[PDB]
Ligand binder design. Structure first.
Ligand SMILES: Nc1ncnc2c1ncn2[C@@H]1O[C@H](COP(=O)(O)OP(=O)(O)OP(=O)(O)O)[C@@H](O)[C@H]1O
Ligand SMILES: [Mg+2]
Lengths: 49, 97, 49, 49
């Protein structure tokens, strides 16, 4: 809290958690996510469902 | 609504504000419904007492002489669930979700 | 080329008077009347039209 | 209803030469000369007209 370089990127992250799979159905996504480490990623991307 | 030609007062509209996707979405139907009530079953119930119970049985709250809760704050670690929960409970009431 | 342009705007609300309130990109909001190629199923509030 | 829309201005400035600068609600200001119904005695600043 009380930053803008690591606050603002967290309220668009909170949007994502929650759009990628959230409220909305299904469709045909199947979102291919790609990353270099899982050691500095949010635990919601890390988990399945 | 006004005639643009001459700015005549044609017929008074609806005040309807500006809800586009904003409020219009009502979904509560499957995948998540009231056959997905497998939980975490006390946690779902708590929601029912708070929410469905004053909707469906609003009079019990008079008898006792309280108000019903103002909200059910669900939180937790992600995926465990709270998208779950909220949508099943909504489907059972069938109101303006 | 001389055929006219058609104005894109986004549906603010749906009126139950056979009319649609569309908030145009112009700036004003216009009350407009449907045609035979318009139906409620394909309209939503958020509908570019 | 058909009547020419009588636009609202607010007597933003005034002069003793007949001219009264009315900030119109369109955006800009106009300098207009008042009729014989309304008089410069009736026109004070803050007066919507
Ligand atoms: N108890 C449950 N049984 C089965 N499926 C579940 C259960 N809890 C959650 N799910 C499902 O797991 C998937 C992923 O979790 P979801 O993103 O919905 O959860 P959350 O805890 O509300 O999240 P966030 O913190 O990411 O906003 C969904 O399809 C959801 O319906
Ligand atoms: Mg969630």
């Amino acid at each position: 809290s009380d930053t803008s370089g690591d606050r603002e990127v967290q309220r668009t992250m909170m949007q994502l958690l929650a759009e990628l799979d959230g409220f909305d159905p299904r469709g045909d996504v199947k979102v291919i996510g790609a990353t270099n480490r899982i050691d500095i990623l949010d635990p919601a991307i890390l988990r399945p469902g | 609504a006004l005639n643009q030609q001459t700015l005549a007062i044609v017929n008074v509209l609806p005040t309807s504000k500006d809800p586009m996707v904003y409020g219009f979405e009502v979904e509560e139907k499957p995948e998540v419904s009231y056959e997905d009530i497998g939980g975490l079953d006390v946690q779902i119930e708590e929601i029912r007492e708070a929410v469905e119970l004053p909707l469906l049985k609003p009079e019990l709250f008079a008898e006792v002489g309280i108000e019903p809760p103002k909200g059910v704050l669900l939180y937790g670690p992600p995926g465990t669930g709270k998208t779950l929960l909220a949508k099943a409970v909504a489907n059972q009431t069938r109101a303006t979700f | 080329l001389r055929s006219p342009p058609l104005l894109v705007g986004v549906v603010s609300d749906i009126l139950e008077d056979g009319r649609v309130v569309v908030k145009s990109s112009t700036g004003p909001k216009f009350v407009v009347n449907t045609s035979q190629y318009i139906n409620e199923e394909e309209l939503k509030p958020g509908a570019r039209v």
